[PDB]
Structures are given as C-alpha cells and as structure tokens.
Amino acid sequence: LEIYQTKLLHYLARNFYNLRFLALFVAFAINFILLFYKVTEEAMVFFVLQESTGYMAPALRALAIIHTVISLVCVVGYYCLKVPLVVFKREKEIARKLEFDGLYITEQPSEDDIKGQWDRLVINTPSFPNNYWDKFVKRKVINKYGDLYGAERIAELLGLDKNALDFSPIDMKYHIWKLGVVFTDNSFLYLAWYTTMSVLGHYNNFFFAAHLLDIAMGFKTLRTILSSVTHNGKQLVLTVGLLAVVVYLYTVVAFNFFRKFYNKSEDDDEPDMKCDDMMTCYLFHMYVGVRAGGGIGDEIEDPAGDPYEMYRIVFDITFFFFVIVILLAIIQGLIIDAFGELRDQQEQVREDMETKCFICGIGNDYFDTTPHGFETHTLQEHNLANYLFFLMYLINKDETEHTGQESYVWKMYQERCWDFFPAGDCFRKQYEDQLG
Amino acid sequence: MSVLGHYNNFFFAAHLLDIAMGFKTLRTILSSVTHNGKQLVLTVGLLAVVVYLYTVVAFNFFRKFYNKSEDDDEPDMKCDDMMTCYLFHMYVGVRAGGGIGDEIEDPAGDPYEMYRIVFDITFFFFVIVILLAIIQGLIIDAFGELRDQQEQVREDMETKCFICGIGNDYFDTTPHGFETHTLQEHNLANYLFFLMYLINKDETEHTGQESYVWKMYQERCWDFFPAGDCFRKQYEDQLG
Amino acid sequence: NDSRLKCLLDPAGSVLNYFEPYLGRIEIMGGAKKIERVYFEISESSRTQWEKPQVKESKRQFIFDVVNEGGEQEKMELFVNFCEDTIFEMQLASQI
Ligand SMILES: [Zn+2]
Ligand SMILES: [Zn+2]
C-alpha cells in the first residue's frame, strides 16, 4: 500500500502542469457547452440547454465531475511538488535569522511582523528543520549564545533536553506551523479557490465561467501582457481616485449653480432632476459624464439663450479637457511607459550579461585579447553552473573526506563569508606574466 | 487572382494589397503591427474572455434590460440565450464609446440599479479604456523597439571593428586610424572578394597562405579570421 | 609550456574526452591570498536536472532579478541562496 501511495504521489507530482492544462481544456469545453443555454418561462425561470442532438447535457455533467477530480488532484500534486520548496525556504530563513541574528534570543520580532510571530512556534519542535539540510542549527545556536545567555535556557527554548546535550548514559505543533505556512502561500490559495469554484460549479454550472481566468495564469505571453497593467497599478488606482475627486468638484459646482440643466425627463408632467441632491448628481457625473465622448456637456440641457451660458460653456469645455482628454491620457501613458520600462529592463540585463563576468566583474575587453577569450572565461573559468555543482558536491560529501580547499570553502560557507568568490581577479590576471 | 479577374473584374481589387509588399516605407510601417502580432492576438482573445464573463453575469442577472424593441407588441430580447447575448456584447458593447451601458435600458428606478452601474462602469474601464490602451501601447512599443534596434546597430558599427572586435579608441591614436582600419585593413568586402578569389581558383595554383585558408575553409574552421588582434597590434613596436 | 606533458597527454585523449562532462572547474580565492583552481566531480543526474526547462527559466529569472532589483544586498549572498534553492529543487526532482 505504501509503495502504491508513493508511486501515486510521485505521478501526481511529475504531471502537475499537464493536469493544469487538462483542467484548462475541460473548462474551455464546459464554457463552450454553456454557450448553448437559453431561458424558458415554463412565473418560474428555467435554464434549458437548446440542442438538436441530446448529448451535451450528459457531457456537461461528465465534464463537471472530471474537472472537479482534476482540480483535487492538482491540489494534491502541488502539495507534493511545490510545498517542500516553500517550507525549505522558510526553514532556511528561520535558521539564518536564529543563528546569525539571534531572532528569539537577543532580539524579538516586531508587532508588525506576523511571519516572525508564527515562526516562533517551530523552533522548539524536534522535527525542525525537516527540509533544510543543516541539522546542527540548534547546536550552533546553543554553542554561540550559551556563554552569555545560559545553555539550559536556550536548550529549553530550542526543545532540547539537558541530558540530550551530552551522552548521559506525530509532531502536531510542527504540522500546525506547516499548515499555517502553506495556507499563506499565494499559489496554494489560488488552487484552493479554483477547487472551490469547481465544487460550486455543481451547484450552478455558470460558476465554471471563472476558470477561464486561468488563461491569465497559464500562458507566459498573457502574463507578460498583463505585466504592463500591473507594473503601474498603484499609479492607475491613484489616477482613478484623482478622477473621482475632480468629478466631485465639478459635481459641487453643478449642484450649486447649474441645477436647472439636469432635467432628463421627456414629458413636462413629471421631471427627472438629476442634481437636486449631491449623491444623485455625483453618481450622474461619475457614471454618465465620464463615459460620454464629449464630457458632461453631451448629456445635459443646451445652455444657449441663458444668463449662465458662458459659465456653462467653460464648465463643459474644462470637463472635456481635464477629465476626458488628460486623465485617460495619463492612464494610457502609464500602460505604454510600463511596456517601455519592461523592454529597457530586459535590454539592461542583456548588456550587463554581455559586457562583464557575473562572478568577478571584469569586462570582456580584458578577456577578449585571447581569441574568444570572454566566451572561454564565462563557459569554463567562471561558469555559474560549476559553482552550483561545487556547492552541491560539498554539501553531499562527508566532512572527514574534505580536502584542504574543500575544508576551506566549507568553513567559509558555514559562516556565510563569500570572500572565496573571486572579485576583480581571475586565474589569467594573477598568472599573466607566467601564462603569457 | 489575375486569372479570376476575368471571371469577375472586382477580383482585381486584391492586387492593391501589393502596395504593402512593394514600398519599403509601408513595410516598415506594417512592421509596427507585425512586431507584436502574437501579443495583439492574445489581447483580442483576452478581450473575448472578459466579454464572455460579462455576458455570463448579464445573462444571469440583467436579462430585463436587453429589450431592443421600440413597440411593446413584439419584444426583441437580446439576452434570452447565451449565444445571442455574447454576440450582442462582442458586437455592440465593444464598438460603443461608453461600453455596454450606452446600448441597454436605463437602470434608474430599479432594485438592481447600483449593480448595473458597477457593471457598466467596470465594462467601460476594463474593456474600453484598458484593453484598447494595451493594443495601442503594443504598437507604440513596436515603433520604439525598432528605432532602438537601429540605433544599437549604428553604435556597434561605429564603436568597434566587425572582424577583430577592437574598439575605435585603440585605432584612433593615429589620425583617422579607425576609418583606415575599417576601409583598408579589415574591410568586409575584401574578405568577400578573397573568398570569391579562392573559390574561382585552381587548387594546384594556390600559394601557401591560400592553401592554408582553403584547408581551414573546407573544414569550416574560422580561426584564420583575426579575433582581438590586428597587424598594427602585433607589430606595434616595429611600426611605432 | 611543457612539451613532455603534451607527449604524455596523447594516449590519455580518450580518457580525458570521456570525463569532460563530469570534470568541474571553479576558481576561488584561497588561504594564501592567491587565486586557486578547484577540480571536482559533476554527477550525470545533476547535469540532467540542471538542463531542465524549468530550471533554465528559474536561472534566467534569477539573473533578471539580480541585474534589475538586486540592489541593497550582496550579489554573492543572492547567488548562494539561488544555488541552495536550485539544489533542493534538483534533488526533489531526482527523488520523484
Ligand atoms: Zn569572471
Ligand atoms: Zn579589425
């Protein structure tokens, strides 16, 4: 049973993205079927699927069940594929803050830091750290801080027995903390919302219309396009607020001086005054004036032959210029500037990667004296993947088997000292006389 | 199409599209549309999805406002089924200046007045204002990107040699030295003419240098092209 | 600049060509205040998991973030954090 459970969990973890694309395909099919609905009065309103074949309603029920199953197994596959990395990052950050800052020994988390208060629950658990590979965190913290804070107090803080320090001849709290970490993850919350809408789709089929919004999360090109909207989204919200304030000012002016022009009634038996109170006039200006092509002047009474004709003309013209022309141009310019800024950031990345080394920072003109010397330097001498593979080699090796250089780098790595990375120097630069 | 123009003369109207292929300026202008054409198609698809969502909301809650009939003898309900309401939203609401609110019943004096106002305002903001701005911004960004690519070509050709890659500041110690280097020493046309000379020559008549370059050329080995080195750099002590 | 070694490496050409994928080189600043070259072993599973498209996307996202929004922090600290996260991801992908 355990072997089959492990195989099922690994199969769901391996095919997570394929199941997400399958869910998107099923949602598209469901909405294509939903396009064939109609309303019948036989009062009581009935939603009937008009069809000349008689097959689309069992197909709709089958697709709803299939979509709910796929959403559930997508959540399960997410828990076995992406949750370990999130827990690994959180545990690593907790360990670094505990050892190199004294987060729960010397200092304390602020009242505005919910993460520190929640992570206080995990330090005394015996399972911590579970995904982080450094299993001597508590011993390091004890050895660092017991001289000035007492070994017994820190051992009680870190959930370590006094007899457990020497030889001396289901963890519920950790899982509660892990559930709290998982439930605050954005992708898990998105998948939980997706599954909730899939479950609600059986209560009413049109709840399957929300899943089409997954195209905003599934395709990289659409994410890049929507990044032009979310780049300056704060400025967009502030521009909409500024538009609301300006329209409120025009509403105040109209309610004080131009009330007679807001009769929207065809017949004189019953008027339809839109500006006899401030709330109705403000709603009218925000809903009718902004959407109108020429401003508020398109939708109110003609001001000709009136004592306030020139004031009304100035009112309409400044409403057209300030709101219709300028603020919408600010919105469009923010979107276009977002496009240009993203393109400039990508070009900056390209130029920085082409002009200097990522490790040592020496420019390509020094290396290019040798034919194709910078390509040789970035592919063989200071290759980033080689540094990743060396860290992977050092971690997966016994400390008693370390050589002198490996011990040197390992000791500097455990202290978070990155002076072993070459900075402004390389093998060619140091032995330039001997190699040349 | 020219042959079909004898069957019906209006088939000759297609050939005017040849102005898009005949003039270089028109091709450059249409490159601002075809640069981000994939993003344009994806934006139109996103607009279709958003309008479908608004159609679902209107078909569930706002069916009474979609009567487009002047007389009460025979109604013209546009949202009594999902297909008609979706076609109405995609064809009438998008082309309208103020959104779907321009073309349906006035919501005043209704229990669902505020929901209808929020519906119309968010249709106007998300579809009319934002998505068309995304389309226009994609076109303008295509213009700017093409201009930046041309300026990058100009700067790269002015600042370093195409063959050896040495910058102009090394050559410009001699007066007009970089122009001399790019016109006489490492001229691209001279390398083209040398390859043309090598191909059109008998192998038995090749000299030692020509045989060396020919053997390296048949193996696709381009180590004979100087890279980071030139005649002035190698003999700098003897020439200077 | 030794010719006897070049006459010695000729029979080792096939052996040196076999271990070329598995032979990793880095350069460090050693304890003698000199640049040293470190030779180590790269496993084949590490090579296969490094060349996955998702790992490549993660690497290019990391480079983008370091170049643009990489200020106010040491670049090598961010690089080591990226390496640790990538190593964990690769090990998890090898487990499943
Ligand atoms: Zn380097
Ligand atoms: Zn040159």
Automatic annotation (TrEMBL), chain A:
Signal peptide span: none
Residues that bind Zn(2+): 357, 360, 377, 382
Organism: Neovison vison
Family per record: Belongs to the ryanodine receptor (TC 1.A.3.1) family. RYR3 subfamily.
Cysteine-cysteine disulfides: 275-281
Localization (cell): Sarcoplasmic reticulum membrane
Binding site for ATP 2: 357-358, 378, 384
Top-level lineage group: Eukaryota
TM helices/strands, residue ranges: 17-37, 59-81, 176-194, 237-258, 317-340
The protein, known as: Ryanodine receptor 3
Binding site for Ca(2+): 400
UniProtKB/TrEMBL annotation, chain B:
Chain sites annotated for binding ATP 2: 161-162, 182, 188
Segments crossing the lipid bilayer: 41-62, 121-144
Protein origin, superkingdom: Eukaryota
Residues involved in Ca(2+) binding: 204
Protein location: Sarcoplasmic reticulum membrane
Bridged cysteine pairs (disulfide): 79-85
Residues that, per the record, bind Zn(2+): 161, 164, 181, 186
Family: Belongs to the ryanodine receptor (TC 1.A.3.1) family. RYR3 subfamily.
UniProt-recorded name of the protein: Ryanodine receptor 3
Organism whose genome encodes this protein: Neovison vison (American mink)
Whole-protein coverage range: 4620 to 4859 of 4859
